[PDB]
Amino acid sequence: DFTVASPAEFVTRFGGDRVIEKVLIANNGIAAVKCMRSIRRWAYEMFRNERAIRFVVMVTPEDLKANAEYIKMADHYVPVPGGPNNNNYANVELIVDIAKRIPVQAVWAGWGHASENPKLPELLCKNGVAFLGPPSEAMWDKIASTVVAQTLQVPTLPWSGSGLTVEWTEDDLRISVPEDVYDKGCVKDVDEGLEAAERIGFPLMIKASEGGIRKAESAEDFPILFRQVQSEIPGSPIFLMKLAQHARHLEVQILADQYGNAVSLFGRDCSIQQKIVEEAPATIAPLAIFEFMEQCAIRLAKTVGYVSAGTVEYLYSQDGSFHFLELNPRLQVEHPCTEMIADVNLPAAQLQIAMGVPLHRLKDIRLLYGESPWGVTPISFETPLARGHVIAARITGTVQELNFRSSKNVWGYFSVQFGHCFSWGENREEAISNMVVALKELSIRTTVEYLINLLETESFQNNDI
Template structure:
C-alpha cells in the first residue's frame, strides 16, 4: 500500500479521497490554485502546494506541474478524482513515465472509452446493446444533418469527448439542427478541446441507469449493482439513488454482465461506470463508460458497505479486488441530492458569492442492534460530502457544487423521509441554492412513486416551479423575535450601576399601551408589522391579523408562541436583512429603517446585465433593432456552460456595450434597452 499520494483535484472529491487515506494511514498532498488558497481541501490534507492561477487551465489542468509537485513531495501515486485530468490518457501515461502510479484505469482504456463514437463501435463488437445513432468520424455538417434525418427526430447531439452533461442538445425538428450543432461544437471545443459530435435517437421517456464496475490487474471484474440517475436538468444529474426502483434481479444481472463485458473489452482496471439508457419496457442500451470514480459513488457505498476509494487504492497498489461477485449484497436504499449554488427559477443559472451562513443536518450513523455501525461508508442515516465551509466563496472558475447530501434507509420510503428531513435542515445565506427546489422534487408524487425518466422535471414543472408563496405571519413572527434578540444583545450593562433599570428597557409605558412598528422589504413589496404591548401581554399585528405573541430567541434559534401555535425556527441577522428558516422554508426580509427609507425607488432604466462573471461568445442584436420579450440577445460562457440572455421586455436596443471575446464581471451592463415607440 502507498505511504503518500497526491490528490490532483479540489473541493469535495479531494476531501473525500483524503478522508479514506487518513483512515488507512496514508499521507496526502493537496494542490491548489489562486482561487483555492483558503479552500477546505487545502486544510484537510497533510500538505498543500500552490500550482497556479484561478482558471483550471492555469492550475488543475497543468499535468506537467502536478507531476513535478508529486515527485518533489515524495508522493508515490496520484489520485485524479473526477473531472480535470481524471480521464486524460496523456496524463496517465505521463504519470507512469515519471514513476508514479495513476490511481485509475490504464491509458489504453481511457483512450478506448474517451471517444464516445469509438467506444460505441467497440461495444458493438463486444455485443453490448447500442441505441440507434451515428458515431462515425466524418463530421461534415451536411452528413450529420442527413444522419439525423435518417434516425428520425427528436435526436440528441452529444460531444464525442464529453461528459457531465456538457456539449449536449436535444433537437426536436430539422429546422433547429444547424443552430444546435453549432452550439454543441462550441461548447465541446471549450470544455474538452474536441468539437466532434455524435448523433443518437432521443428516447422520449428513458431512464438513466448506470452500473458501477471494478476490475483488478489479476483479471477479476465485478459489478457493484446499479444507480438510477434519471432525474436531471440540462442533462446533468440532480438526484441519484441505489438500487434502481423496480429493478428485477434478472434485469440487474443482465445489465451488470453487460457492464462487465464492456470493461473487459478494453482491459479495464480500477473503478468505472457503464452508463445505460433504459426504456420503460426494460430494454437498455449502452451510452458511455466513465473511466473514473463518479460524483454519485456514495449511494453505492451506502448500499454495499464498501469504501470505493479504498478499493481504488488497493487495486492501484496491485492488490486483488476485496470481494468476489457472489460476496456482494444490497442492503437498504440510498439517495443523493446535489446541493448547488444555482437559481432553479432562472434555468438553473449558477450563482457565485460567499457562504456567509451555512448550517447543515448533522451526520447520523444508523443504529443496528443497539450499536453504531463503525464503517463510515456502511449504513448511515445522513452523510454529507462537502468541499466548502461557512465563509468560503463559490467562484465562477469551477463547478458550483456546495455539497452532496446522502441518506440511507431500510427501504426507499424510509430513505425518502430521511432526505426530506435533511433537506429541511439545510440553511444557506449568501447566494442562491437549489435546496428549496430539491425539497419540492423529493416531495412530488412522480418521484415519490418512482415514476422516473429523464424528463421528470419538465413533466412536473407546475409542481416544481410554483409561484412564490407570500410571506406569512409565521415568518414575520420569527423575524420580529430575531430583531428583539438583537436589540436585547445590544443593550449594555453600566458597570458602575449593574442594577440600572435601563438594562431592561423595553416597550413598557407607565400609563398605557405601547407599540413597536417593523417595516420589511420582500418580493411581495413592503410589509408592515406592529408589536403591541398591553397589560395582558404582547400582540403581533400583520396583514389584518392580530395574535398573542411570545418569543425566546438566542444564538440563531428561536421559539415563538403565536396564538395557540408554537413555532420553532432559526434565523441569521445581517445589517440590512433577517433570514428566517422554518419548516424547511427560507425567507429573506430586508430591514427597512423608515427614517432613511426613500419614499419612492429610483427607476433602474432598461438594461441587460451579466448574471455572473463570464466571456461573451455571441451577440445576436445591434443598436436600433426592435426586440420582443424573450428574444435572445447575448450568449455568455461561464462555468464551462453556455447561457443565453434574453430580452426582459419588448423594446429597442440602444447600445451593445461588449463584443464577442470580451470578459465581463457579474452585474456588468451588456446592452441598453429602450421602450418600444
C-alpha cells in the same frame, strides 16, 4: 482481525506488486477531503496507523486564502498557480513534475480537472508513478466506444454508426477500432447526413465528436443545424444519434483490477433530473434487467482493459430497453451511495488496486460476495444483496460537513454553495422519509422547500419515469 505493520508488508501478503505509501492528490475541496478520510480510515484498520498512507495536496492561492480544510488535513502541501484549472489541477505536466520531485508513488485525481485526461496516467506511467484510475490505453471518443460496445453486444441507441462491429475474438492474449470502420460511423456531408438521419429517425442529435451539438426535429431543420455544427468546430468528425423517449439515466458502478478481473457494485438511478436526486441501488429497473446491464458493463470494462473505479452510463426507458451512453472513467462525487449499499470503501479500493492487489483480495469485495474476509481464493463474480437504500439530493476549496441532530441515517456536506445530503434507509420508503426529516431540520430554505415538495409527491414516492 488481519493487520500488518506497513504498506510494504501489505503489498507482499495481499499479492500486490507496488508499494504506495505516499499519494499526491490533484484536486481540492470535497474530493480531497473524502480521498483522505476514506484512505486514512482503511489505513487505521489495516495498519492500526491512520497516517500509514501519506498525502500531499496541491493548493491554489484562492484555497489558501480561504484556509480550505483539506490543506491542514494533508500531511504536506505544495502551492500551485491560481486561476483556471489549466494552471493548476488540470495541468498534467505540473502534476507529474510535483509527483516526481517529492516524490510520491501515486496520484489520485478524483473527479473533474484532469481526471478524464489520458495524458495524465500516460505521463505518470512514463515517470514511474502510479495513477489511482484507469491506464491511458484503457481510457483511450463516443464513436469508437460505441462501436466497441456494439462489438460486445451491448445495446446502443440508433445512430449513424448502428450495426458497426469490429474484429474481436483476439482474446485475453485490448480492442481497437480501425480508422476505416470509424468513418462509416461519421456523416461527412449534409447529404449523407440527411440519408443517415432518415434511417435513424427524428428527433436526433447532431454531434461533433470533438465537443458542438444541435437537436434536429426534421429533415427540413437538419441542414441548417448540421452546417451550424460544422461552423462551430471545423474539422471534427460529426455523428448522428437518436434521442431517447420516456427515459431515465442509470449507471452501473464498476471496479476492475490490473489482472482483467472486474466486478459491478450495483448501480445508481437518477430519479430526478444536472442530477437533482440520485438513488442506489437503481430500483427503477427490474433486477433481471439491471443484472444484464451489469454483465454488459463488466464485459466492456474487461475488453478495454479498464482498471480502478468507473461508471458505465445507460439510458433506460419505461418499455425496458436500455442503451449504452459512455464509460465515465473516474470516481464520481455521488459514490458514497454505492459505498453505503455495497459496504465498499472506494478510495481505499482504488489505492489497493493501484498497488497491484487483485479484486478477490480486497476484503470489502470478499465480504460483499459472502466469502471469508481474508481468504485468498479467486471468486466467481459471474456465478450479493444491496444493503438498504440511499437517496442523494443535490443542495444548493472549503468544505462544511452537514450537522444532523434529529435526523438519523443522513449525512452530507456543502462547499464553496453546492453540496449533497445522503440518506440511508432499510428500503426506499425509509430512505425518502429520513431525507425529508433531515431537510426539515436543515431548514432552520429555498433548496429545502424545493426538495421536500419533490420528495413528497406521489410520482416520486412511486418512482414513475
